[PDB]
Amino acid sequence: DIITVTLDETTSATKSANADLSKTNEAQMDPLQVGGEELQIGGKYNFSYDLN
Amino acid sequence: DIITVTLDETTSATKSANADLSKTNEAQMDPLQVGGEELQIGGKYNFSYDLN
């Protein structure tokens, strides 16, 4: 038996995925000055730091 | 027996596919400075790194 087929096909598929991570640090301190002079810890260490 | 055929044919087919992948890293740290001097681990290693 003869049967006619209408070819009408349309398929479409998409997918996506993304990720992000970020972190930052910034800590800075000038040498501490008390009494007109620069404070010293130990023998050669200041009250200062720098992180980045 | 004589039969007349009307030639009327029109077929059309398309297909497509694509893919993407991407990844990136960027980690950078300046040498850590505490107490006015540059911190050293071991004997010659800083607190710094650079990844790309």
Describe what this molecule looks like in 3D.
The structure is cut from a larger assembly and holds two copies of chain A (52 residues). By secondary structure, chain A is mainly beta. In chain A, 0% of the residues lie in helices and 19% in strands. The first copy, chain A, is built from no helices and four strands. In chain A, the strands form two sheets. A two-stranded antiparallel ribbon of chain A has the order 1-4. A two-stranded antiparallel ribbon of chain A has the order 2-3. In chain A, strand 2 and strand 3 form a beta hairpin. The radius of gyration of chain A is 35 Å and the shape is rod-shaped. The termini of chain A are far apart. Chains A and B meet through strand 4 of A and strand 2 of B. Strand 4 of chain A pairs antiparallel with strand 2 of chain B.
What is the helix tally of chain A? 0
The largest β sheet of chain A comes out as: 2 strands, antiparallel
Work out the oligomeric state of the chains in this entry. part of a larger assembly
Helix content of chain A: under 10%
Over the alpha carbons, how many angstroms does the gyration radius of chain A reach? 35 Å
Q: What series of H and E elements makes up the topology of chain A?
A: EEEE
